[PDB]
Amino acid sequence: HHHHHMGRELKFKKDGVEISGYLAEPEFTKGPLVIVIHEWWGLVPHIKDVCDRYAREGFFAFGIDLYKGKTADNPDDAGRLMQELLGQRLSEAEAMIKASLDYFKENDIGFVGRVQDYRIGMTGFCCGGTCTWYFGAKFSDEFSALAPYYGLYSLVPIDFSAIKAPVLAVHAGKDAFVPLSEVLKAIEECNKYGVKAQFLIYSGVDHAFFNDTRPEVYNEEYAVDVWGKTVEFMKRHLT
Amino acid sequence: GRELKFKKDGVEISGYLAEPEFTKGPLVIVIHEWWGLVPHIKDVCDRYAREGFFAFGIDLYKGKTADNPDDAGRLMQELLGQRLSEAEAMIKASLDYFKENDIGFVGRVQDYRIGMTGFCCGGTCTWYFGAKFSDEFSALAPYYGLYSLVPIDFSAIKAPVLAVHAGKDAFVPLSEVLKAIEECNKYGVKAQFLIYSGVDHAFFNDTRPEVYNEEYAVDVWGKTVEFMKRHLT
Questions:
Q1: How many domains does chain B have?
Q2: Which GO terms of the molecular function aspect are on file (chain B) (predicted)?
Q3: Residues 153-192, chain A, touching B (beta carbon < 8 A)
């Protein structure tokens, strides 16, 4: 079928940094590229599954590993990994993103015939939503669509003034980690700088409601809804 | 499209009915802005009909329209302030009329599927009537309604809601949208809030170049049609 897709582990070095992650590839529908950034657990099966889902919709999807091969299954370990990434290793993570983009472009991954140019998006969840905003602002000439899910705005400074891509920002109405007052502040910054950002806030659900492997927070109805919206948005801006 | 005019249960009903290709299908009630039932709203009804919905642009102003804000404000204040019981009766009589004519009846589910959407004043009305007639609606899509005009009983709402807001809305501060989200959280309302940065009130209205935003109008239309299809077909 036209939806056929496979996946493979990448591991290589470029411009002095080690890149690894999971690349899901459509067999027939060789479309735009989406970079997918994991939660604070690391690059676990759920995130690779999300990549596969993108590939079935006609996107190359790269689940980049920002934790150098480490994963966590408990909050104490996960918290340590995330703090190290966002504190000590942020410049390294930036370099990994940049080297990844260069790699894909050199391999013509993400080249779209209709526009005769590259079309690369980025999405992520939790910590990965923070990263989507942050890297979206840092590499504002590289991305054509951003879809951060329930990122925190208070961890690293997001340069809203630099964002050039359209943004679909997904938030949970009862998010324990991201108060609605923080979302409001992000909206006001987007208003101030003319960022083309749409904020989608689902009432009644918690942080990580998209994660189907976490029955304590997963919400099927909204997960299905938001997937529909996200795919449509990525198609609109990347094809 | 047909201009309806009739009486039921002591109230005069009028509005514009746009009809899809088939004789049967879901119904969307479309509520006008404070200008009244003007060509733009009838066009929106036509757009719904092209997507397979019966769409009824109900006139809540008894045939009056306004082309300037002073007149429009007077009409809206009279409707919401003095004639709200009458408007409720018109909504109820409209629903009864369509049901008796098997409009809104969806074969797949062997039941009525009626949605409601509206803009500005009509968004306020969508929330209000959605709460008042909570056994009647299967989907609500209020666009940039005010929450401070009429009492919205969030606890009564039973339909899913797609609430559209403008990030730089001069009439609806973001603090009011926040409060509505918190009420939906509190009472278990299945509401999704969509807030578009950088745009003003009425950004969907393609006849108003000072506020129309094509990119977001196209986006929100796509999302609204998908939402109505999900809940009404």
A1: 1
A2: hydrolase activity
A3: 173-174, 180-181, 184, 187-188, 190-191
